[PDB]
Enzyme design. Structure first.
Site, PDB file in Angstrom:
ATOM      1  N   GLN A 142      88.785  22.387  20.219  1.00 17.88           N
ATOM      2  CA  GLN A 142      87.774  21.444  18.348  1.00 17.88           C
ATOM      3  C   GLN A 142      89.707  20.920  18.068  1.00 17.88           C
ATOM      4  OE1 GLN A 142      84.651  23.313  16.700  1.00 17.88           O
ATOM      5  NE2 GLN A 142      84.679  22.129  14.807  1.00 17.88           N
ATOM      6  N   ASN A 183      79.865  19.162  14.812  1.00 14.96           N
ATOM      7  CA  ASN A 183      78.949  18.761  13.630  1.00 14.96           C
ATOM      8  C   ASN A 183      78.237  19.986  13.262  1.00 14.96           C
ATOM      9  OD1 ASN A 183      76.501  19.948  15.032  1.00 14.96           O
ATOM     10  ND2 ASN A 183      76.222  17.956  16.182  1.00 14.96           N
TER      11      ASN A 183
HETATM   12  C1  LIG Z   1      80.985  22.525   6.418  1.00 18.14           C
HETATM   13  C2  LIG Z   1      80.557  20.719   7.359  1.00 18.14           C
HETATM   14  O1  LIG Z   1      80.245  19.928   6.977  1.00 18.14           O
HETATM   15  N1  LIG Z   1      80.704  22.134   8.181  1.00 18.14           N
HETATM   16  C3  LIG Z   1      81.046  20.520   9.551  1.00 18.14           C
HETATM   17  C4  LIG Z   1      81.045  21.279  10.820  1.00 18.14           C
HETATM   18  C5  LIG Z   1      81.623  20.014  12.318  1.00 18.14           C
HETATM   19  C6  LIG Z   1      81.517  19.105  11.884  1.00 18.14           C
HETATM   20  C7  LIG Z   1      81.321  18.420  10.611  1.00 18.14           C
HETATM   21  N2  LIG Z   1      81.304  17.074  10.774  1.00 18.14           N
HETATM   22  C8  LIG Z   1      81.322  19.243   9.657  1.00 18.14           C
HETATM   23  C1  LIG Z   2      76.708  23.692  15.917  1.00 18.03           C
HETATM   24  C2  LIG Z   2      75.581  23.417  16.153  1.00 18.03           C
HETATM   25  O1  LIG Z   2      74.967  24.573  16.126  1.00 18.03           O
HETATM   26  N1  LIG Z   2      74.920  22.038  15.867  1.00 18.03           N
HETATM   27  C3  LIG Z   2      73.387  21.702  16.085  1.00 18.03           C
HETATM   28  C4  LIG Z   2      73.203  20.548  15.933  1.00 18.03           C
HETATM   29  C5  LIG Z   2      72.225  20.385  16.603  1.00 18.03           C
HETATM   30  C6  LIG Z   2      70.946  21.005  16.743  1.00 18.03           C
HETATM   31  C7  LIG Z   2      71.573  22.517  16.070  1.00 18.03           C
HETATM   32  N2  LIG Z   2      70.724  23.396  15.883  1.00 18.03           N
HETATM   33  C8  LIG Z   2      72.126  23.103  15.954  1.00 18.03           C
HETATM   34  C1  LIG Z   3      74.723  24.141  19.061  1.00 21.51           C
HETATM   35  C2  LIG Z   3      75.645  24.408  19.708  1.00 21.51           C
HETATM   36  O1  LIG Z   3      76.167  25.883  19.556  1.00 21.51           O
HETATM   37  N1  LIG Z   3      77.391  23.678  18.657  1.00 21.51           N
HETATM   38  C3  LIG Z   3      78.581  24.362  18.876  1.00 21.51           C
HETATM   39  C4  LIG Z   3      78.654  25.696  18.661  1.00 21.51           C
HETATM   40  C5  LIG Z   3      79.857  25.946  18.870  1.00 21.51           C
HETATM   41  C6  LIG Z   3      81.077  25.227  19.150  1.00 21.51           C
HETATM   42  C7  LIG Z   3      80.861  23.557  19.896  1.00 21.51           C
HETATM   43  N2  LIG Z   3      81.618  22.548  20.073  1.00 21.51           N
HETATM   44  C8  LIG Z   3      79.627  23.533  19.649  1.00 21.51           C
END
Ligand SMILES: CC(=O)Nc1cccc(N)c1
Ligand SMILES: CC(=O)Nc1cccc(N)c1
Ligand SMILES: CC(=O)Nc1cccc(N)c1
Ligand SMILES: CC(=O)Nc1cccc(N)c1
Ligand code: NA
Length: 164
Positions: free
Chosen positions: A62, A101
């Site tokens: 990431q 996200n």
């Molecule tokens: C707190 C926050 O915005 N967290 C977050 C984590 C992963 C992707 C993006 N866009 C934002």
């Molecule tokens: C980072 C993460 O967990 N993202 C995410 C996106 C869509 C649905 C749910 N439950 C969680």
């Molecule tokens: C939904 C979920 O588990 N999302 C997630 C969590 C950790 C790392 C990445 N890439 C995506």
């Protein structure tokens, strides 16, 4: 055709090589355009100089938090966050490029490159491209990760941009 972009990556100040990515603008134009512009830096900000801050072996690498460098930050070319465009492309295997996200409709700049098939992310993260060249570099990055995601070397995108 679809944009080809590149990331040149260092680990502890020594070059690992280049990751080349196809951005699937034909499927997700808005998501592809965001990543493209962040690679060129044409909006005045982007990926150059930022890090792979979270790397988990046998999962994903990431990056893209160019504001906080820790997974809390980043911004898109449209504003702070933008909606999930669609979930049409799937997390089919190693090399998949997908948006990180913090839940539905929170795409910013953070992204990940999968090192395995991550099917449980289908419908939750927007897939928008794949590795064309440089999986060897991705595997190097992956090797500097840990179960916690903490990196054992400082992984820096030294240069990035658009090839075509
Ligand atoms: C707190 C926050 O915005 N967290 C977050 C984590 C992963 C992707 C993006 N866009 C934002
Ligand atoms: C980072 C993460 O967990 N993202 C995410 C996106 C869509 C649905 C749910 N439950 C969680
Ligand atoms: C939904 C979920 O588990 N999302 C997630 C969590 C950790 C790392 C990445 N890439 C995506
Ligand atoms: C030839 C091709 O398209 N390969 C491909 C496709 C989707 C994801 C990944 N990682 C690789
Ligand atoms: Na092209």
């Amino acid at each position: 055709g679809n944009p080809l972009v590149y990331l040149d990556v260092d680990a502890n100040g020594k070059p690992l090589g280049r990751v080349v990515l196809e951005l699937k603008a034909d499927v997700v134009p808005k998501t592809a355009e965001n990543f493209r512009a962040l690679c060129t830096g044409e909006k005045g900000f982007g990926y150059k100089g930022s890090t792979f801050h979270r790397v988990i072996p046998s999962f994903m690498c990431q990056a893209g938090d160019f504001t906080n460098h820790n997974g809390t930050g980043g911004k898109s070319i449209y504003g702070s966050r933008f909606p999930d465009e669609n979930f049409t492309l799937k997390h089919v295997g190693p090399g998949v490029l997908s948006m990180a996200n913090a839940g539905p409709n929170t795409n910013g700049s953070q992204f990940f490159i999968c090192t395995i098939k991550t099917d449980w992310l289908d419908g939750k993260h927007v897939v928008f491209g794949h590795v064309i060249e440089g999986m060897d570099v991705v595997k190097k990055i992956e090797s500097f990760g840990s179960k916690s995601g903490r990196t054992s070397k400082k992984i820096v995108i030294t240069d990035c941009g658009q090839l075509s």
